[PDB]
């Protein structure tokens, strides 16, 4: 006729079953094609909770299922915006539905650049998922780009501009990235379910009941303050029980140390014949291609780690064992970085005498909460027209904003708390997961 690619609908609404949202609804051809693109399909083979998933049994949900979730919350929000908060009846403070497609695409593609065990992988190799996401969307060698380009020649650039917070419409940008966006709302609910963290679940329906657009972006009806508060508390709960949880952090250290060791053996003339990890080679060399990056996923790396147990290097072989047996390093807390630097260095010698290289079996670690402007880093609430920020009306949120925790952890093998005179000497400086 021809119906433009923008407006193409499915004969019948496609659906995806979901434990968090019940059903993911797909009705645009573009969205379906985006979902079926190699780039987005790759996310099925990548765990949302990287190393942290090994902390809770069964929490191996993929980044793909999270992406669909953000997409789903987003369309629920756009549907709410059109039915009762359009430009047609609110003017400048209204929502333009012509923005529906782009926000849906950005929602779904917001995490395409992640890669396996993203956070840890991101440190060892100089990669950046936010930039790769934008790269995937804007470079022609991608199925995502080819799909977007069919919407309009300038569409790939515009979708990318939403992700980088440069898109001219704030309502679109904040729906995908703010202090209370579709992205955050999804992973908090999704990670809460899979890890079984009961206190991590908040009521999404209440928040959706009060969500609203306005001139400068996205606001929430004043009366829904406590529903927003419940979201803040749930965010706090996920942070302490799941994200900054000690044993999940002990898992990141092991993976970090495993990859470090792998890279050092590779750069060394004769320390490891050939570790057979062809897909990691371009990364060890520091000369990687986009296509080479897209070939990587959790399954690919797990295969290599399993193979590294045979590698004639005690350190590498032992770390791969500890990673696959899902046993992280144990830890203890401390406040003084300089005053307790003597105690740390001392018990590091004790770890050597036993047979553990402190560079690989020890670590010092420390750590994003809600804090009003010092902007777009605040959630706003509408009274009778005007806008006020959350911490100004919520003593609870104001309390958690000023609460900053300088948590400092010291890692070591669990086997230190089990020729036995040294173990007795070591455990003497640790009482209830804290230094003495
Ligand atoms: Cl990770
Ligand atoms: Zn996300």
Q: What domains are there in the chain, each with its CATH number? A: 4-244+368-405 (1.10.3210.10), 245-367+406-436 (1.20.1250.30)
Instruction: Tell me the three-class secondary structure of the chain, residue by residue.
Output: CCCCHHHCEEEEEEEEEECCCEEEEEEEHHHHHHHCCHHHHHHHHCECCCHHHHCCCCCCCEHHHHHHHHHHHHHHHHHHHHHHCEHHHHHHHCECHHHHHHHHHHHHHCCCCCCCCHHHHHHHCCCCHHHHHHHHHHCCCCHHHHHHHCCCCCHHHHHHHHHCCCCCCHHHHHHHCCCCCHHHHHHHHHHHHHHCCHHHCCCHHHHHHHEEEECCEEEEEHHHHHHHHHHHHHHHHHHHHHHCCHHHHHHHHHHHHHHHHHHHHHCCCCCCCCCCCCCCHHHHHCCCCHHHHHCCCHHHHHHHHHHCCCCCCHHHHHHHHHHHCCCCCEEEECCCCCCCHHHHHHHHHHHHHHCCCHHHHCEEEECCCCCCCCCCCCCEEECCCCEEEHHHHCHHHHHHHCCCCCCEEEEECHHHHCCCHHHHHHHHHECCCEEC
Q: How far apart are CA 65 and CA 16, in angstroms?
A: 9
From the list 159, 118, 110, 119, the residue with the least C-alpha distance to 139 is 159
Q: How far apart are CA 179 and CA 371, in angstroms?
A: 9
**Angle of helix 100-109 relative to helix 155-163, nearest 10 degrees?**
60
Is 129:114 a contact under the CB 8 Å cutoff?
yes
52 CA from centroid of ligand 1 (Å): 7
366 CA from centroid of ligand 1 (Å): 15
Residue 51 known to bind ligand: no
Residue 55 known to bind ligand: yes
From the list 259, 275, 321, the residue with the least C-alpha distance to 117 is 259
Ligand nearest to the CA of 323: 1
Residue 350 known to bind ligand: no
Residue 353 known to bind ligand: no
- Resolution, Å (one decimal): 2.5
412 CA from centroid of ligand 2 (Å): 32
134 CA from centroid of ligand 2 (Å): 14
Q: How far apart are CA 210 and CA 220, in angstroms?
A: 5
Residue 287 known to bind ligand: no
74 CA from centroid of ligand 2 (Å): 12
82 CA from centroid of ligand 2 (Å): 24
Residue 111 known to bind ligand: yes
121 CA from centroid of ligand 1 (Å): 7
Experiment used for this model: X-ray
Is 235:229 a contact under the CB 8 Å cutoff?
no
From the list 401, 406, 430, 435, the residue with the least C-alpha distance to 418 is 430
Q: How far apart are CA 412 and CA 331, in angstroms?
A: 6
Q: How far apart are CA 168 and CA 171, in angstroms?
A: 9
Residue 435 known to bind ligand: no
4 CA from centroid of ligand 1 (Å): 41
26 CA from centroid of ligand 2 (Å): 19
In degrees, to the nearest 5, what angle opens at C-alpha 241 toward C-alphas 240 and 242? 100
Ligand nearest to the CA of 71: 2
């Amino acid at each position: 006729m021809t119906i433009p690619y923008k407006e193409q609908r499915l004969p019948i609404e496609k659906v995806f079953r979901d434990p968090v949202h019940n059903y993911i609804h797909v009705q645009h051809q573009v969205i379906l094609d985006l979902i079926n693109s190699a780039e987005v399909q790759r996310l099925r083979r990548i765990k949302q909770l990287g190393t942290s998933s090994f902390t809770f049994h069964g929490a191996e949900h993929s980044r793909f299922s999270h992406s669909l979730g953000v997409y789903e919350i987003t369309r629920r929000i756009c549907e709410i915006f059109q039915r009762n908060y359009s430009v047609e009846r609110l003017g400048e403070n209204g929502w333009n539905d012509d923005e529906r497609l782009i926000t849906l695409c950005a929602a779904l593609l917001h995490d395409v650049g992640h890669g396996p065990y993203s956070h840890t992988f991101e440190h060892i190799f100089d990669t950046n998922h936010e930039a790769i996401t934008v790269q995937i969307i804007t470079s022609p060698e991608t199925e995502v780009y080819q799909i977007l380009n069919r919407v309009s020649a300038d569409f790939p650039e515009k979708v990318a501009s939403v992700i980088t917070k440069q898109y001219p419409n704030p309502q679109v940008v904040q729906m995908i990235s703010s202090q209370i966006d579709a992205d955050r709302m999804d992973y908090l609910l999704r990670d809460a379910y899979f890890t079984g963290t009961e206190y991590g679940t908040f009521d999404l329906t209440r928040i959706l009941r009060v969500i609203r657009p306005y001139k400068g972006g996205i606001a929430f009806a004043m009366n829904g303050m406590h529903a927003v508060e419940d979201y803040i508390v749930s965010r706090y709960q996920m942070y302490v029980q799941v994200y900054f949880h000690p044993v999940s952090r002990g898992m990141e250290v092991i993976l970090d140390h495993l990859l470090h060791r792998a890279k050092e053996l590779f750069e060394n003339p004769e320390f490891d014949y050939d570790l057979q990890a062809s897909l990691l080679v371009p990364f060890f060399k520091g000369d990687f291609t986009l296509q080479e990056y897209l070939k990587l996923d959790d399954g690919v790396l797990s295969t290599y780690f399993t193979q590294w147990m045979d590698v004639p290097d005690s350190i590498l072989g032992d770390l791969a064992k500890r990673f696959l047996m899902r046993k992280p390093l144990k830890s203890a807390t401390f406040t003084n970085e300089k005053e307790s630097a003597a105690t740390i260095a001392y018990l590091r010698e004790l770890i050597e005498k036993v047979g553990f290289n402190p560079k690989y079996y020890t670590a010092i670690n420390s750590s994003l909460p809600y804090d009003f402007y010092r902007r777009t880093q605040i959630e706003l609430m509408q009274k009778d027209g005007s806008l006020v920020e959350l911490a100004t009306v919520s003593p609870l949120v104001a309390a958690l904003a000023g609460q900053s925790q300088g948590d400092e952890r010291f890692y070591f093998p669990k086997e230190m708390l089990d020729f036995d005179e040294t173990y007795r000497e070591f455990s003497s400086y640790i009482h209830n997961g804290a230094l003495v």
